Amino acid sequence: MRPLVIILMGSSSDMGHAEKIASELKTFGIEYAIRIGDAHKTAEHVVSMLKEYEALDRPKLYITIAGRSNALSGFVDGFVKGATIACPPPSDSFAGADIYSSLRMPSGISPALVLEPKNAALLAARIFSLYDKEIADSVKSYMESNAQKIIEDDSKLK
Amino acid sequence: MRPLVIILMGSSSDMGHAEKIASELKTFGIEYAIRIGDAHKTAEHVVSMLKEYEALDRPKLYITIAGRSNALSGFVDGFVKGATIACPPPSDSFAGADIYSSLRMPSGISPALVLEPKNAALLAARIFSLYDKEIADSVKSYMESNAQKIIEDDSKLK
Amino acid sequence: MRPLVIILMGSSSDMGHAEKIASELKTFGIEYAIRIGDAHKTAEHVVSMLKEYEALDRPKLYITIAGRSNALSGFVDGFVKGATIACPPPSDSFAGADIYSSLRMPSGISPALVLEPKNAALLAARIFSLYDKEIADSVKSYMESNAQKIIEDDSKLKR
Amino acid sequence: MRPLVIILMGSSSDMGHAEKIASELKTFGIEYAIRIGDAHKTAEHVVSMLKEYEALDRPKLYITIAGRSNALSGFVDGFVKGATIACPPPSDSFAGADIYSSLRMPSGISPALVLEPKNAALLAARIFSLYDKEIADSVKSYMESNAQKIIEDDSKLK
Amino acid sequence: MRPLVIILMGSSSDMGHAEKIASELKTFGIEYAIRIGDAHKTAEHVVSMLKEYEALDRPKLYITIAGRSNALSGFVDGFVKGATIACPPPSDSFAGADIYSSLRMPSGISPALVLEPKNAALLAARIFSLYDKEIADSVKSYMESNAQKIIEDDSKLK
Amino acid sequence: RPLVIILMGSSSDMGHAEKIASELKTFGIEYAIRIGDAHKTAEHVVSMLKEYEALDRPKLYITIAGRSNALSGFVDGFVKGATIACPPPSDSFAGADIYSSLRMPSGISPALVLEPKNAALLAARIFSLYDKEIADSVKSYMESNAQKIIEDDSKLKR
Amino acid sequence: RPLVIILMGSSSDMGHAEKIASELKTFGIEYAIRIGDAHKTAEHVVSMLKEYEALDRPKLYITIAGRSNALSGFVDGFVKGATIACPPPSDSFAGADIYSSLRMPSGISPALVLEPKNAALLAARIFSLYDKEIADSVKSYMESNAQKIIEDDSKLKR
Amino acid sequence: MRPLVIILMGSSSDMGHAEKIASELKTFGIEYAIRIGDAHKTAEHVVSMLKEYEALDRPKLYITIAGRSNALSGFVDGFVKGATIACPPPSDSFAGADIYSSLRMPSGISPALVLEPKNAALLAARIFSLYDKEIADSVKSYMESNAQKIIEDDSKLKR
């Protein structure tokens, strides 16, 4: 079956950030789910949700979004079989130092960290593209279009 | 009933830090248990253990020790009923920025952060001391002793 | 007698922060007092106040609020018998580096550091709850409510 | 054909770090190549190398390793079709601030950042595992073994 | 032959910063070109452009402007023969830590880092001034003028 | 006739204090060296300051406290005259203990100086405003420092 | 009879300087306010300091320079008596300009104070060692500060 | 006459750092002078020295080396006509935060900041190379050699 991306955020306050990821997945033609669950406060709810998705026989990725000290990405990553992507929401608290909670994983916990929500979506697409030629075609068009916009911007100048 | 402190560390590599906490609790006459469990890799093992301690009919505190990005303190704090203390092991990586993973809790997750292991033990004692006169007496002796050492150091000069 | 939390701040400029803590303590049914006193400029005043609260035969906690370089939390913690909680006001000066003045205590000075005012109240409640069943019931209702709101948000907004 | 991981480092001084990644890929039964090329000094050499690998009709990932200001990961990522992983070598220069050069990509450049070399290898395996059942089996054993070591460590204690 | 400064920016979003540099070069009577090209997304476009400028038989400098992780300055510096100047746009993200991506060059890549755009222009002028007396005269007038403004500000007091 | 009271929080600070004391002695300025902690032995410190505050002579206090420095503010809030904070060096959290000495509220005004020889020099130059002997001593000291640099140039001139 | 010379690097620093001057006036201490840059108008600064250094009266210099503060060290290396550095506030690079005022070599000893009211108070308390009038003024000031806190408690006592 | 690079350091303690720069300039065939002088303690000495070098009719650069808070690079840059290069010694104090004293110049003070001593030499060479073909040839040989070593390492060590 088709690829699936599960976008899991710790709080409804993260929804703006999540929708940016979702919007971009939609341009790659990649199905997504958007869910809310907190690692520390609703662990059992999160586990029961992950079991449901894990049971689907289709290629899947999880993109985990948690502000402040991000425990969610590692929690999900240590539970599910396949790859996951951490895409924390932006914060300038302590000059951005919440980022270290996403970076500093133990050996054996391996979420892919990406800062920009459009890049989390692009990484997800490029992961599927190793085996999905339709998604590979979409990635090519997207990345070529990004390069062409820059060159055109220069042409408007010289 | 007599107090219990459960010292839970994410890794056997944290044992030196744990033992400093434990040694200090012993000077206050406070029973402890030392346990190992990782929030991301062995979550079910941690829950199982917490349920066992939570069922004991005695006043209890948990002191949680986890290096790198500390997910363990919030995990435990979100599960148990009573208060908990976060006492992460020291690290100089990224100028100590692992500390932000212990600091930056969501609303509703409230571990007490203390840096020095002797102070984690002292805080625990002083928490019990609100209701346990035996421990209050021990705390008084301990803090008076600390102060007298300094005053003595001054008189010893020249 | 019932628990008491003394909320002591270094400056009246911190009153809003103190009120957030007191507001949350009220939800747990915990009596509080709000006081002002500075460790360096009004030490004797702070000592006099602490002696009065310390003489009360009831379980107590102090929550200490001081901006910039926080000397109040250690001063109070070194004086009183029981536990204390540091909950400094937030600051973005020097990328938040005032926090290190609350973190870096000498051995023998052990205030509990908590950043969020609601969490300072919750920690206080959970400290009393080791021996106080009624406060433990309140904590449980509070923490269950927080969880249920998250699950309800997922039930509504999930796609 | 079988998956391939191309480990590309900017300098021979990075070889120790690269070999940790390679060693771990070998435990997952994943073929790898180890190569050296600098983005700024040997761009054409890097491009000619990437064209050679890109022409292989097999699932591939690139893991890019560059110290100091990491320009290599983004350079590779903007050239190749599929996903890439940035795994910079550790440094304590400016308290680790070289990490921001790997983090702060423009929209449209999406390398997966992972700090630990064993985790770069595990992420690579888990990426292939979405479609490769043999690698999925290896990941399961690996991650289960990591969890079991922790539980056993606790058992030696309580 | 008369000097040329090529102002190359990674994005059209950098134009305000570029124009401050350009405006200041105009006060020194130094010809400039403003161009757009991204190191990671449009590398071939950048190389093509550099070859065109490199073929001009006149003394030239490149001022490279790129936000976030600055790969552009080292890319250009590794390609062209003569000196280059890095003048990244200002950013307050992560307490300005994007600056380390411009600072931390490998041995063999030597762009001049200057923060203020007016100073990037002044450095360029002063570089040419070692051999161009017309520009030396302009630089002298400019720096003398700056000093006289301050002394005047002092006398204007009260 | 002036007196400098060097007060340190811990006997661990002695090496730092003695660097200050030695330098003060080359200025021919009498000093006292004392130990006392602001949080643990507050009464001992006050009793001590009262003894010094009663002396009819010019005096300065140089206060030395590691970690979070509460001692300088405490002393400064109590004594009439100026004080100097000279904290011991630390690499903990990339030296962030320094902010506890910097960030004083309005009304608490210790002079912050990092180098112990400079704490002594500031003390001297403070007295030198009214003490012709100390001023002569400062002039000789500062001239010696300059002549050494110049003779280094004359010797290692290349 | 004492004099405080407030020297700022740029007219942009005036608001900061006037906060210092206003406070000095409540202490009844005469001040001068001057503008001069260490790098651009070094001769203008020296000529100015020579005028002040010749005056037979107690004097302090409070030096104000934004960005990388070279002014305080320059002034301190030239004048006989003590000086005070009071840099203007900045959020650039999370306030890292402060290190240019902190990190003096042995032999250069300006007193660093962050708050302008505290720069004035330090100045006063420096004179107060030999000036009974200023000392009385300091005592009244510092007592007023304390009484206000206490009456705030009495008023907002809950 | 031929180019000259004046390497001026604030303290003899920096001599090793200066030597790394001079060593690299020698490989490019560029004459250098090594001098010592401090901006705050020996200003007049520094000015006197700069006046002597400034009077020479030859292309020159100054490379300025000062630890801790770097006031030397701006002082020299504000005095001399032509370009200068700041190359401070490395420090790990405060996580390397001395670097901000070399970065944060006022408008009108424009030293080129470069961290590595070999790169300060290369930048100097590349500045002269805009007008000096012989130095341009040397730069090209240098930069080609660096590239070829990397490619050779790949050819040996590739698996």
Ordered domains of chain C (ranges, CATH): 1-159 (3.40.50.1970)
Token duo for residue G80: 């006989």
Helix (H, G, I), strand (E, B) or coil at B154: helix
Helix (H) or strand (E) holding A136: helix A133-155
The number of C-beta contacts closer than 8 angstroms across F and H is 45
The answer to whether G90 and F42 are in contact (CB under 8 A) is: no
The span from the CA of H29 to the CA of D120, in Å, is 45
Find how far residue D51's CA is from the centre of its chain: 19
Q: What are the DSSP calls for H91-133, one per residue?
A: --GGGGTTHHHHH-PPTT--PEE-SSHHHHHHHHHHHHHTT-H
Block residue for tokens 């000086």: G83
| CB of F44 less than 8 A from some CB of B | yes
The number of C-beta contacts closer than 8 angstroms across C and F is 93
CA dihedral (C22, C28, C33, C37) positive or negative: negative
Cβ–Cβ below 8 Å for D126 and A61 = no
The span from the CA of G148 to the CA of F152, in Å, is 56
Who contacts H23 (Cβ-Cβ below 8 Å, separation ≥6)? none
Rg (CA), chain F: 17
The answer to whether E91 and D54 are in contact (CB under 8 A) is: no
Token duo for residue A57: 């026989």
Cβ–Cβ below 8 Å for B83 and C143 = no
Residue D106: exposure state from Cβ atoms within 10 A (0-12, 13-18, ≥19): buried
Interhelix angle D72-79/D43-54, nearest 10 degrees: 40
Residue H61 phi, psi dihedral angles, 5° rounding: -130, 150
| CB of H73 less than 8 A from some CB of G | no
CA dist list (Å): D45 to B6, D42, D49, E78: 58, 5, 6, 13
Go through E116-125 and write b for each residue having 16 or more CB atoms within 10 A of its CB, e for each that does not.
bbbbbbbbbb
Q: What are the DSSP calls for E108-127, one per residue?
A: T--PEE-SSHHHHHHHHHHH
Token duo for residue C94: 């020097």
Breaks (C-N over 2.5 A) in chain E follow: none
Token duo for residue A84: 């996951």
The span from the CA of H101 to the CA of H65, in Å, is 12
Touching, F vs E (3+ Cβ pairs under 8 A): no
CB neighbourhood size of F25 (10 A): 12
Closest by CA position to E72, among listed E46, E45, E107: E46
Residue G84 phi, psi dihedral angles, 5° rounding: -125, 130
Q: Which residue of A has its CA nearest to D116?
A: A107
Q: Which residue of E has its CA nearest to A146?
A: E41
CB neighbourhood size of H158 (10 A): 12
| CB proximity under 8 Å: H 90-149 to F | 92-95, 97
Residue F21 phi, psi dihedral angles, 5° rounding: -60, -45
Contacts of F93 in chain B (CB under 8 A): 95-96, 99
Question: What approach was used to elucidate this structure?
Answer: X-ray
Contacts of E122 in chain H (CB under 8 A): 108, 110
The answer to whether A100 and B69 are in contact (CB under 8 A) is: yes
Who contacts B127 (Cβ-Cβ below 8 Å, separation ≥6)? B61, B83, C82, C83, C127, C130
Q: What are the DSSP calls for G28-95, one per residue?
A: T-EEEEEE--TTTSHHHHHHHHHHHHTSSS-EEEEEE--SS--HHHHHHHHSSS-EEE-PPP--GGGG
Q: Where are the beta strands (DSSP E) in chain H?
A: 4-9, 31-36, 60-65, 84-86, 112-113
Cβ–Cβ below 8 Å for G36 and E99 = no
Residue B95 per-residue DSSP state: G
Residue D100: exposure state from Cβ atoms within 10 A (0-12, 13-18, ≥19): buried
The answer to whether F85 and F20 are in contact (CB under 8 A) is: no
Q: Quote the Cα angle for F42-F43-F45, to 5°.
A: 65
Token duo for residue D78: 């903007």
Cβ–Cβ below 8 Å for E157 and G36 = no
- Provide the H-helix boundaries in chain E: 15-27, 43-54, 72-79, 99-103, 117-128, 133-155
Interhelix angle F132-155/F116-127, nearest 10 degrees: 140
Determine the length of chain G: 158
The span from the CA of H68 to the CA of H97, in Å, is 9
Residue C139 phi, psi dihedral angles, 5° rounding: -60, -45
For residue B135, the one-letter residue type is: I
Cβ–Cβ below 8 Å for F153 and H41 = no
The answer to whether G77 and G108 are in contact (CB under 8 A) is: yes
The answer to whether E9 and E18 are in contact (CB under 8 A) is: yes
Report the largest interatomic distance among the alpha carbons of chain B, rounded to a whole angstrom.
59
Q: In what order do the strands lie in the sheet with A84-86?
A: A31-36, A4-9, A60-65, A84-86, A112-113, D112-113, D84-86, D60-65, D4-9, D31-36
Residue F117 per-residue DSSP state: H
Token duo for residue G16: 């900061």
Helix (H, G, I), strand (E, B) or coil at D85: strand
The span from the CA of F72 to the CA of C40, in Å, is 9
Who contacts E137 (Cβ-Cβ below 8 Å, separation ≥6)? none
For residue E89, the one-letter residue type is: P
Q: In what order do the strands lie in the sheet with G83-85?
A: F30-35, F3-8, F59-64, F83-85, F111-112, G111-112, G83-85, G59-64, G3-8, G30-35
Cβ–Cβ below 8 Å for D147 and B41 = yes
The span from the CA of F133 to the CA of D90, in Å, is 55
